[PDB]
């Protein structure tokens, strides 16, 4: 589907057009706030280190996302995950 | 069609051809014009683009290929756009497999290298004469042959190509074929044995010893379509009449100095070349036997180092004098067996000194022995010689001899034996008495003196030796076994054989040899008395008891050796004489059996209302012995005449009761009964009893009823009748008293085989059990007088009885034979756990349906809790159709063939029909056929050419009853006749031994005549000449039978196919001209280890022929032949021929011998890639056997034959089971149950255990009782997971759990199983990030230590030092400056350290980025930006991997660089990127792992390394790939569940995984080959397993 490719590329116009015509993990990996708002993902966001994306997702073997935060070394992301 | 016609009519016009091709794209013969145009201008001009476009636009491809367009395509292939168009056209055309195969065939004939390689890469398998024969017949280039060999092809095809190329004169192709066929680089050996190479020259052997455009085109086509010197040289079976061609100074004579093993056996050599022996200066295992030598070379010992010389079938001359000038000390063994010597080597003392084993068996050394001044001699052999006397100094200078052997020699005395003597083999000599020297030996352990004649066998006092291990004294004349002196001195003896000896009694000291594990006292014919002291010998597991009529009541299955020792021990505890006899009364209806018994009963408390069943009842006798006897008032009516033979026992005394109310005729009615008594109980006595005097006058008694009894009833086919009376069985009288007295007297004096069976002694336990059983007979419920097994065990535990579960089978069998109860030990009935007390009720309720009453008479269905078992007995005692009341009148039957020329008819004349003969038969003869049964015949038929009519037909003026078998003369009819013949003969032998009983007194009537009918004049002869079967069998020398006039003859097979081997599905006979066989000790295989199997030649090849004795049974041979006609498998030995003149059996010869001998002799030949093949082939054989319901008995390392020692062969192992211990499953050895395939699986697991060990648990040679030890723990074997796991799964005590043989082969079939050395489990909750090797070999894991040979637990890098960097930096080294960021990469080069923020440190501080080294110059990358470098420390390149965002998503493309591998094209892996990115080294520009996993699961690459690219995904899977077409080889699903670091090591591959648990796996580097080498190895077998069908 072209929606996945558009989300990966981060093109806001292309993503909006595809959504209006009638992928969360890709958007989280890209770390685009507009793509995330238009459109697990928490673990990917913690590994990459996008605080805004993680906060938006929280508002909206495969262990818990907070497990990888310590290994990834993102202190702010680890604190945010521990808080929730 | 106008354009095509114009083009065809106007050729040789390129300009017009271009327009025609252009208009073609905008028809069988239409392609002809295009093909002609392409061929004409293949290279004249570059106008082929239009033709390619038209072909792409265009079943057309098949016609084009048939139009020889392949030649045009090859000419064009032999310009990027044109190349791409050609590749696309080829890919489109070669889509169909048939077209690809046709193109490969049409390209192989011409000499080319590029097109063939491209087609092979595209596919085009070389198994369709086959390909290799064609490419070898045309004298093609070596490149073509090598390329074809590297592909998939049949081994037999390569062998045929070898024969073809040997026919021609060539070296390159022949050498390539030999290398494909016989080259084991892993084992450093050349297995050139089995091939029949005429000669050997250095030109062939030279290349045998150790010293790209096509791929690109194939890749483009695929893309378009998608859119250590060697040592051992074996030259055995080649008919090498001469070998001097290898004695020259060629390029390999320098390489021929590292042999250490030369094998030339089964050849036709004459003399070893002297030049070859002097240039072979490192050879220590040379053998050469089965050669036509004529004299010892005398220079063969002049080499530097030599051992294990072997010349064991050559015809060496009488004199073998070794040259005194040679002083070789390196020789150890000197085999000179089976030659034509007559004096021992005359310089054995000087030429060789450290000789260990000197074997000279089978020679003809006649002269007296020399002093034999050898100082280091260990084993001496002189068996099968012609020797008269030994010199007094024969063994006076060999102080180390251990196993001197002299069998089949004419020796009379023994000279001074050295004190170190340990083993003597002096059997088959002529020794009057045991010499003084043998007795004075102090360390004798194994002395065998069988086949001698020694009158005096000294007791333990006169034996100076204390360590007596074995003693063999069979086939001697020994009358005394003196043991009373010192019974404890021989306490160490295990084997003591005394068969074929004139022994009278075993003295009462045999119980002091507690270690005696095998005592053989058989065929003495005079013992009749085993002393009760044989109860303290619980170490005896075998004890042959043949031709010993011992009073012990033998059992069919409840009689094992240890059981006999237990019984003897119980008798030792307390012995009481037994007094019980069976008095079973027989007679006809109305004869007064019951009334006679009642008057004999002295009972008046009782119309008898006939008698159903057998009506058992006990009787005590009041002479002053108790003598309790049980009477069986047998029924008389002729319907209960089939159950009677089961209740007729030899150890009983019968009666026979008249009816004189008629007289002169009822005496003639006992011929049935008396003949049956003779048949069932030959030795038992009979007491005829008249039973009507009060209503019969003196006339009838004076009639021949008293005279014919003394005239015809007394002898001539009837048992030993002892006395007869004429009592009146209605009141007590003098006659009745006399009858009682004579019954008692006959009972007291039975004397079965002169043993007085009426008063034999038994242990008191049996009498106690009997007393308990009759005590319990009352309290059982009347409806079911039977108690179960549990109640019996409760009773046996409750009382003081001291019999365990081992005594119960024998005890209950003896109590069954006594007659109080009946127990069925057959483990096929549903009744084996139920013990039948009160047999009277059993018989009465069994015979219930016989006396009670759309369809033919005799056919009933199931009609009126225990009933489901109640029928099971009925079909076992021939009650259920019901053979009783089965239409005695023969129904009308029209034979389909009645022409006297195609019906084989057999007659079975007997005096009468024994009781229930037809009942046992028609219940035994049984595409479902159509059949209708009657009382005395079956006539079961399948087709007009397949029928069998067996019945009873009488003849006029013939009082006897004749059995007639009629079958058609076809192959199916012959098989039917054969099967019926064995069934009838087996029934007669097993059930009525009195019929087949040649009585010594009188004449050899044999009481049973088996006529075989034959007619000379085919059709309308109406007179078949009788012929006795034995007389015809005496005519076994010829095939044709003819009368006194030789004018006419008829083949035996047409009149008696059961005699000549023609009653089998396949015609199996051998032309004696082709066979070249002669019985001799030389031709024995394995020195009698296999039995009577010799070596012979059949159809030119070599075979192993099993030779049967002269018993003339012809029943075991046919039984063994019928099974071998249904077993066709590569791993099962195959049938070749089966004769009748010597009555042999021809089988294939496995040149490498049995497995046991191999692992006990050649321990260095069982490489890790050969044991797997052996086990796989054996598992395949077991799977096939159990597939067709056949069950093997026991698998041992002796029952497996090895056909070749080459790992890459089609067959390496086969199974064998010749006719005539510790490898026992714990399901039958401990207990009793029917043998099942689970026992076979257990035995196979045992065989795996012995194979895994280098020698196994069989070198020790001791007692071998889930307690087996860990093989790696003590046997020194290398570890082998999934093989030790397979053993442990094959050695579980629960047979139901153990895997089926169908699944064990599957488990044994895995490329991972062969290539997996070690699987080390780390301590729990241990996390390791980086690991390094150290090479004994060890692993440093981030600095924890691990030992390769000990498993000794106690970033990173590896100058015996290590360097580690913490996550916060602070670089450290253990036999430095702390960088601003953590050291992420480390490598040893002349050292580089990475950085998190991007920086490299050379030990330079250059920073590139804002971390993963490699090699092969150098390479690597930081972040997403890969680069390259060298010793110049400069970035020679810089490529952004983020630029590949058009194909992969930004999630995988924009990540960092985790690792890179560079050999010719860089492969880079990104974090959580399931698509490894391939980047070229020049063009600066997709291996989707997830796709491969979906084809077989995180799929995210975490680490990878090259040699076949190994990619370790994050899901725990190792994807295996190759550097050609990027085709998936295997997906190794290791148990790691993840991978952290994988790396090469010294050639193995270490893998670290997280399962928390850390697993360190050690794969083998050879793994990518073993995935394929095995996969094509199974198919080449599977097709074979299907070719035999
Ligand atoms: C000569 C004659 C006969 C045989 C033989 O085994 N025949 C045979 C018979 C029966 C069965 C299967 N029955 C079925 C059920 N039964 C209950 C159990 C098994 C099998 C099988 F199990 F195979 F199917 C093989 C082997 C040789 C041989 C040889 C030889 C060849 N080469 C050699 N080299 N050195 C020594 C040496 C020796
Ligand atoms: N009067 C008389 N009858 C006899 C004599 N012996 C036998 N019987 C008759 O024989 C019958 C018993 O037959 P029986 O032995 O039970 O037949 P079986 O059980 O089939 O052998 C009784 O009815 C008696 O009347 C005899 O000596 N005198």
Numbering used by the authors:
A (entry chain B): 51 to 72, 85 to 101, 117 to 137, 147 to 170
B (entry chain A): 587 to 612, 624 to 655, 661 to 680, 688 to 737, 742 to 824, 834 to 849, 982 to 1360, 1364 to 1381, ...
Authors' own words:
Mutations in leucine-rich repeat kinase 2 (LRRK2) are one of the most common drivers of the familial form of Parkinson’s disease (PD) (1–3) and are also associated with increased risk for the sporadic form of PD. LRRK2 is a large, 2527-residue multidomain protein. Its N-terminal half is composed of armadillo (ARM), ankyrin (ANK), and leucine-rich (LRR) repeat domains, while its C-terminal half contains two catalytic domains, a guanosine triphosphatase (GTPase) (Ras of complex or ROC) and a Ser/Thr kinase, as well as two architectural domains, a C-terminal of ROC (COR) between the GTPase and the kinase and a WD40 domain at the end.
We also present structures of full-length LRRK2 bound to these inhibitors to understand how the presence of the N-terminal repeats in LRRK2 affects inhibitor-induced conformational changes in the context of the full-length protein. Next, we compared the kinase domains to see whether this difference in global conformation reflected differences in the states of the kinases themselves between LRRK2 and LRRK2RCKW. This was the case for MLi-2: While our structure of LRRK2RCKW(I2020T):MLi-2 showed an active-like, DYG “in”, αC “in” conformation with an ordered activation loop, the kinase in LRRK2(I2020T):MLi-2 had its αC in an “out” conformation and a disordered activation loop. Our analysis of the conformational differences between LRRK2 and LRRK2RCKW bound to MLi-2 and GZD-824 suggested that the constraints imposed by the N-terminal repeats had a bigger effect on type I inhibitors.
